[PDB]
Design a protein around this ligand. Structure first.
Ligand SMILES: O=C(O)C[C@H](OC(=O)/C=C/c1ccc(O)cc1)[C@@H](OC(=O)/C=C/c1ccc(O)cc1)C(=O)O
Ligand SMILES: O=C(O)C[C@H](OC(=O)/C=C/c1ccc(O)cc1)[C@@H](OC(=O)/C=C/c1ccc(O)cc1)C(=O)O
Lengths: 810, 810
């Protein structure tokens, strides 16, 4: 049908059809009389997988012979989503499979919807890891993603009576055709025990052993025949575990609980022992595997020439002392040489400045679970503080501020400080965030070791986030400038010469409308909800957090409603306001925010005077596959975090690439987006980081805003009195109290400028041609925000490897 | 190589080689550079499986179109063993695959050893179920095995310091290529709750739901292209189970523990709640599935014309009240019609008379777990006792003896009584056992309903137990009489005309010696133990139990040792005494018996005066795959249970088919074996059932034997004083005390006749030609003990179906 989806040749379509029938018969044990739609999805998955594995084996052979420097990306989260369409896109198979399945009497898009998301992440951090794997393979780097194969990923969210309900995400129920178990690489991991000191150094003895069994998933580059590996570890009890008999067998679950479930916290630290066991489990098994592979290539001087380890946040921070443990205790290297190797091998990426997200583990936990690692951490700390003391003599307070050990009620280990000391590079994820790191939280560390600090602005993969989810837009672009931009997103600048092109303007607006019609239909089918496809699609999708300020959005929605009620026969640009995202199960305030949203919807959506001029919808179960649907249908992207709180954002970049305009604060990567596109092509409002600091020094008083803004006052009174909760008038008392007396994120302070800025958006939308021209200017300047650019910078400036766009033979 | 293993044609070998290479590459993602031996086994397994599935789909199509009466074999145990070789044998593929793998540079026998046993059974009862599935498919019956997919089967036994140690049998670690998950047939099973009475009958409400997910395994008939289905249920928690969040997810294990582990008790009842949950789980899911399939063929009058349910022991006895529950509570049939259907549908096979093996569930357990089923059982009991009262008026004690409810300290339900009342047929498993049922334990029931009681003597499948494990013997037989006997074992009688044939005599003895040499080599390779292959192979393999009297064997071994020590330079027929079998983990006395055996071995095997005239070996980890090795190498089969205790035995039949002679008591199927072969061709000794009864009435006094038999006295003194345990002189005090004061199985009473009979065995073995002629007379008369005969009798006399040896088209 469309060009970017590849060729549908006679030979290929015929071959695909027969392999599909072979898998249906031999693999699935079905025929066309008894096959379920799920059987048809699996037959297709297995057919496409056949094309992957040939390239998989020769990629691993290639790396084995060439022996390049290997990149190890360590993450507790890989937010992968669905695999089928992505694989077809990167193998140029999509049109062929579409034709082949059509000829078999099947709809391929219907089959695609049967695949479960691999939801092994919470939000931005986990999805970044997934975009990274894609870019590393597309750029021909010998890279491996290492994580945990959670049995249950992020929970499925159901909305019941307006409340979030959680259910288990049993994503492996029907099986995963993409993974391959590798029990020959099963490795022991140790916990508890104690430390013995002998003539020849320390020994960690009397430990409980848990086995780590790897499962490999292929990661295909874009049309270069490169297929990299993501290795995920599963926890297994040894066969003599606890070995009355029956109970001993049932208690195996205790060891195997390590890989059972993903902690559903986004940007929030929860200091639970099971979480620590997960962090050590992935680190211990991975490092053993890395070393095995290095040895099967004695000389550890060359270790950093052949290995790079990237730590995605502090979650895998135990890699630093674990590498020291292995080098010192097992390999018998002296401390100083082991440390040189460790530092040169490791690098650390910081994802947030929020204090509640920082990992600070109680010493008593590490003392019981990992007694040897505590000793190593203490020794790392001693030697590090000796260097600080020599550089800044007499500065006793610096010493206490930089210590990896925090004193107080309970002693804690600061894992960020451990990471900085043990890494040769530390990076933030957007320019403003990286500057904040040098100026505030890691200022002392930057003064000691300035060379260590870098910026690597985040990116997203244009394969999943353009070609896959928005084929219509990728096609009208390729008609003008060709296909090369897909793996070289900077080429989108060539679209600037089409900003006055009336044909192109018409096509861009046409693609958007098609996307909006298709999403409006999806809502009626799956969720029985009616919306006007001619209204402005106003969308905020991301995890529910106070710092992301879904509440600010709520205040605007209510403002519009009250304005309509006051002047009903006055014209307003119609809007569909869509808000979606999951709240962490223990995050009470985030759960109340969801309830507020739906409660606003209950009043707004059923007021006869409003009509179809304003609709408020909560998008249930927001996840990667839903993002692929809603993002291409958006007109307006809400990126409204308080300045200084969102380290980067990546959802923002997804919306920019797909033809939505942005309303946002000068925060995270919004700053660089506005810089690329030009400030006039962006809807910027609110306090800058500097204004927030000014307000903090003065003291934030929310009452002042309530007293001076009558419209804001009306909203607070509506909330307090029970306008949005008739049967439970005090339902939202926690929200009001928080807004009035302890709002860390200054919602009221940005209200006036937000409402005013929203008016400017409505004004532009009234002029379709000028809306679309501004859109074209955004799409055309989004090239910087490709993760191919991000990864190339990591490769050159951190890992010391050169990327390659050169094909491997098919 | 050998004829019975089928044709190795040019077209077939070429096709097998390319599919093997296809699976290695595409399925396993390997090439010849990186493949492990385990990868090679899996490539072969997947290649052979391809040939199965085609026949599988058309067998299920056949049954769907013809709509025959379906046989449902309900068992908590299916002791299947390995599947690869069995599949090749039944598909006539063995020689072809042997050639194909040879040409690829691989040894097929080495690959076969990599497959894990499916050890989902304890002993005789579970292995019978497996032989039955094989015969039902070979005889073209539309039969389904229904059970539980245990994650851990019977434990792997390790012998450490002479003691049994247990380890988890993680048989699914590497995956099972034979099974197919069928999540479209996932069914809810209910537990706990309470009973509500409405206008329209009772309702079972407020229940905990556990999901049952089926896994199907193919069961191929012998060269008839019939492939039946074994469906095994796996326990799954629903996705909203217990839905802080993390703990709720981790607690899913509570529901899923139902299918976790097989209870390792052989002929012993353990009244634990988890075991009851297993029994209900398999019954509830199966009956729902049976009914679904019946409806997808309203009219339940015809239900018994289309369905037979066979209960393997009382383990699935809850099928009776569950069928009543479904028919009465859900389908709204009146009690009397529901009951007529139930009785006509169900039949019950009893496997033992031992009181400690009988299932008697505490009423308080059923009251909490299954409140509705208790009500139904009480109502079944009331109506049943009303019939007894009418048939035997005034006989108040009969009423209490026949009641399904047992009174006392704790009220219990007698599940055997439930089975008899709710079944149209009740059978024992050998003629003597069936007579004992009518005369003793079920005498009252037989007087009420004589027509209900039948015999169905057990059998074994000649495919696994001759062709597969003893190809050498199957081949010399086929040379004389053809191949037809393999599915018609009676034809073995034709071998009687070869008893004086000097060529045949030589070949039989040649096959045995080859088997003994191969097993002697297996012992040195896998267990580093040296044995003389020219000695008489004296073997007792079976579960360790007091009733099976491994202890009697031990007394004989010690007698031989003491006789050698007394007269060292006197000639004795050399023996290798092999004893093997698992003890239930909580069975203390069985564990002591194992320790005694190894302790005897420690003394005997290292006495220089003994030499290679006597060796005592404990065969570790006895299981189906080990049975396939040791049985063809045996000269002497020990079948020495106290008369009246072993209901049938099946190991006895395995040894008879494979050219070993039998020393045994007139117990179980030994009686019919001796009858078939002729008493002169069997080594019979000891008390008959009648002699045991005489001794019981008089009072068994072990002291009498100790006082009158000096040799027996010496052994007891050796045991007591510490001759076999120097460092722990009192180690075997429990055994001696049991033998002297509370031996339920009268070991001393059969000692004299046993030793004397053993002398007659040694005498015959001195004359190879006459030994072999007696062997030929055993093999030639073993035809009755084919499970094809057993199943044909079940089919005609219980299930009301006609077997068919007619091929389906390939
Ligand atoms: O990168 C991955 O996805 C997994 C690694 O795979 C490989 O390195 C495979 C190398 C290879 C593949 C195919 C060949 O024909 C030669 C070498 C795996 O390594 C191996 O499995 C290596 C196997 C092997 C290589 C060479 C040899 O002589 C024997 C076995 C690992 O380190 O986990
Ligand atoms: O016996 C088994 O091993 C499983 C049963 O399989 C079958 O009965 C299959 C029947 C069949 C197989 C192939 C055909 O072309 C037609 C019918 C299965 O039944 C089905 O899956 C039936 C599927 C089906 C039959 C007819 C129809 O029109 C739709 C679906 C069951 O009852 O568990």
């Amino acid at each position: 049908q469309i060009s970017v989806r590849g060729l549908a040749g006679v030979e290929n379509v015929t071959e695909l059809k027969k392999n599909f029938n072979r898998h249906l018969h031999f693999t699935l044990v079905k025929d066309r009389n008894v096959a379920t739609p799920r059987d048809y999805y699996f037959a297709l998955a297995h057919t496409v997988r056949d094309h992957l594995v040939g390239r998989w084996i020769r990629t691993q052979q290639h790396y084995y012979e060439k022996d390049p420097k290997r990149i190890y990306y360590l993450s507790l989260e890989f937010y992968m989503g669905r695999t089928l369409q992505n694989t077809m896109v990167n193998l140029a198979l999509e049109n062929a499979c579409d034709e082949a399945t059509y000829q078999l009497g099947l709809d391929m898009e219907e089959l695609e919807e049967i695949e479960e998301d691999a939801g092994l992440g919470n939000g931005g951090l986990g999805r970044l890891a997934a975009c990274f794997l894609d870019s590393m393979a597309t750029l021909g780097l010998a890279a491996y993603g290492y994580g945990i194969r959670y049995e249950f990923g992020i929970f499925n969210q159901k909305i019941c009576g307006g409340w979030q309900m959680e259910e288990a995400d049993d994503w492996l129920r029907y099986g995963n055709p993409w993974e391959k178990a590798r029990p020959e690489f099963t490795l022991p991991v140790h916990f508890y025990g104690r430390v013995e000191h002998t003539s020849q150094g320390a020994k960690w003895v009397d430990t409980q052993v848990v086995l780590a069994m790897p499962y490999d998933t292929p990661v295909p580059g874009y049309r270069n025949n490169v297929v990299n590996t993501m290795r995920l570890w599963s926890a297994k009890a040894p066969n003599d575990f606890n070995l009355g008999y029956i109970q001993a067998v049932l208690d195996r679950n205790l060891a195997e609980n390590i890989s059972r479930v993903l902690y559903p916290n986004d940007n929030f630290f929860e200091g639970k022992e099971l979480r620590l066991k997960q962090e050590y489990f992935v680190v211990a098994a991975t490092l053993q595997d890395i070393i095995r592979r290095f040895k099967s290539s004695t000389n550890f001087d060359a270790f950093p020439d052949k290995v790079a380890i990237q730590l995605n946040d502090t979650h895998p921070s135990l890699a630093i002392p674990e590498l020291m443990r292995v080098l010192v205790d097992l390999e018998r290297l002296d401390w100083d040489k082991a440390w040189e190797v460790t530092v040169k091998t490791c690098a650390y990426t910081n994802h947030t400045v929020l204090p509640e997200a920082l990992e600070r583990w109680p010493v008593h936990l590490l003392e019981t679970l990992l007694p040897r690692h505590l000793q190593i951490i203490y020794e790392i700390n001693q030697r590090f503080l000796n260097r600080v003391a020599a550089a800044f003599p007499g500065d006793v307070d610096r010493l206490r501020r930089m210590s990896l050990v925090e004193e107080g009620a309970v002693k804690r280990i600061n894992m960020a400080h451990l990471c900085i000391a043990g890494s040769h590079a530390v990076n933030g994820v957007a320019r403003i965030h990286s500057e904040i790191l040098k100026k505030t939280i890691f200022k002392d560390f930057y003064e000691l070791e300035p060379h260590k600090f870098q910026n690597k602005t985040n990116g997203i993969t244009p394969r999943r986030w353009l070609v896959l989810c928005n084929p219509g837009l990728a096609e009208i672009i390729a008609e003008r400038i060709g296909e090369e931009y897909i793996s070289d997103l900077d080429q989108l600048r060539k679209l600037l010469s089409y900003v006055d092109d009336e044909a192109f303007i018409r096509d861009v607006a046409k693609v958007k409308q098609e996307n909006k019609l298709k999403f409006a239909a999806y809502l009626e089918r799956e969720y029985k909800v009616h919306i006007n496809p001619n209204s402005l699609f106003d969308v905020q999708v991301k995890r529910i957090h106070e710092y992301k300020r879904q509440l600010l959005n709520c205040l605007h929605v209510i403002t519009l409603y009250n304005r309509i009620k006051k002047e009903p026969n006055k014209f307003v640009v119609p809007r569909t306001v869509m808000i979606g995202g999951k709240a962490a199960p223990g995050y009470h305030m985030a759960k109340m925010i969801i309830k507020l949203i739906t409660a606003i919807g209950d009043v707004v959506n059923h007021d006869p005077v409003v009509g179809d001029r304003l609709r408020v919808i909560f998008l249930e179960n927001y996840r990667v596959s839903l993002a692929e649907k809603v993002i291409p249908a958006a007109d307006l992207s809400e990126q409204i975090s308080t300045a200084g709180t969102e380290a980067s954002g990546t959802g923002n970049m997804k919306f920019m690439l797909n033809g939505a305009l942005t309303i946002g604060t000068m925060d995270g990567a919004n700053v660089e987006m506005a810089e690329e596109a030009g400030e006039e092509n962006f809807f910027i409002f609110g306090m800058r980081v500097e204004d927030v600091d000014r307000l903090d020094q003065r003291g934030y008083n929310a009452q002042e805003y309530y007293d001076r803004i009558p419209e804001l006052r009306q909203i607070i009174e509506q909330l307090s009195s029970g306008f949005f909760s008739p049967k439970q008038p005090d339902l939202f008392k926690d929200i009001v109290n928080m807004l009035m007396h302890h709002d860390r994120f200054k919602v009221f302070a940005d209200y006036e400028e937000y409402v005013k800025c929203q008016e400017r958006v409505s004004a532009l939308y009234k002029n379709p041609r000028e809306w679309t021209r501004m859109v074209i200017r955004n799409i055309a300047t989004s090239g910087k925000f490709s993760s191919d650019r991000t990864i190339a910078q990591y490769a050159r400036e951190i890992w010391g490897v050169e990327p390659s766009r050169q094909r491997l033979p098919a």
